[PDB]
A = this chain, B = another copy of it.
């Protein structure tokens, strides 16, 4: 439809929320090697990371980062680029600053490295092909404004608003079967993702907020409003003048 944020944005959000990744290096004898790594990211999504090993003479490199959402789905990004020690002694201080703010930690400045981002591969979950994102679009994309409270709010809704969620499956999406279960998976500035279980199988649907949302109370409010409208429609107080979502994503 999509009613999702742009993949670039998702990649930035993943890079903001996560702190752990895998550095893919091309070792001495032409054999790939993946190494665990912590990282922080600057205002442009450029990852600075602490590496212990001897960098290697081939500088071509990848950083792979995952974000598991509600134990149900793991969006992923892989930054392809060239790793290098920072040039000046000033940028070393800037990066030590970002690393400080993120981790509240100090670290050997000779262990700081930077991946100049060539391009970013963004995947919605395991086993997807994923889409490529140019480095400048990745650079200018903003992290989702809801990212720090998405997990919490999804938990609260899943624990406290099952009646609303289940109702959403009826009034907001044009299903062709009986919903046996549902969970909210994630929520961002444009809407939220439901997993719907069924005798047929398991499906993922995206339901959009009526208007794009900016902060916590905006999201909560938007949700309340959608609950209210869904109830009023089910109790037949109101017409369903709006169109239902049709697009579904099959998941194993």
A60 cross-chain contacts in B, Cβ below 8 A: 30-32
Chain B proximity of A230: nearest CB distance (Å): 32
Q: Which of B26, B52, B74, B121 contacts A20 (CB 8 A)?
A: B74
Q: Which of B37, B61, B78, B106 contacts A35 (CB 8 A)?
A: B78
A32 cross-chain contacts in B, Cβ below 8 A: 24-26, 32, 60-62, 80
Interface centre among A22, A53, A80 (most CB of B within 10 A): A22
Given contacts A32-B25, A74-B36, contact A20 B66 (CB under 8 A): yes
Closest to A82 in B: B31
- A36 touching B66 by the CB < 8 A rule? yes
9-residue interface stretch from A123-131, A143-151, A153-161, A166-174: A123-131
- B52 touching A64 by the CB < 8 A rule? no
- B34 touching A34 by the CB < 8 A rule? yes
| Measured CA separation A225–B36 after assembly (Å) | 37
A63 CB within 8 Å of chain B: yes
- The interface bits of chain A over 86-116 (1 if a CB of B lies within 8 angstroms of the residue's CB, else 0) are 0000000000000000000111100100000
Q: How many chain A residues touch B (Cβ–Cβ < 8 Å)? A: 42
- A36 touching B123 by the CB < 8 A rule? yes
A53 cross-chain contacts in B, Cβ below 8 A: 129
- B105 touching A35 by the CB < 8 A rule? no
- B78 touching A127 by the CB < 8 A rule? no
| Measured CA separation A238–B62 after assembly (Å) | 57
- B20 touching A30 by the CB < 8 A rule? no
Interface residues of A in 204-230 (CB under 8 A from B): none
A11 CB within 8 Å of chain B: no
A105 cross-chain contacts in B, Cβ below 8 A: 252
Closest to A23 in B: B34
- A128 touching B34 by the CB < 8 A rule? no
A248 cross-chain contacts in B, Cβ below 8 A: none
Closest to A31 in B: B60
Closest to A74 in B: B36
Given contacts A22-B64, A30-B26, contact A76 B126 (CB under 8 A): no
A78 cross-chain contacts in B, Cβ below 8 A: 33-35
Per CB-CB distance, the 4 closest pairs between chain A and chain B, nearest first, are A34-B64, A22-B22, A24-B34, A24-B32
Please give the residue numbers on chain A whose beta carbons come within 8 Å of chain B beta carbons, in ascending order.
20, 22-26, 30-38, 50-53, 60-64, 66, 68, 74, 76, 78, 80, 105-108, 111, 121, 123, 126-129, 252
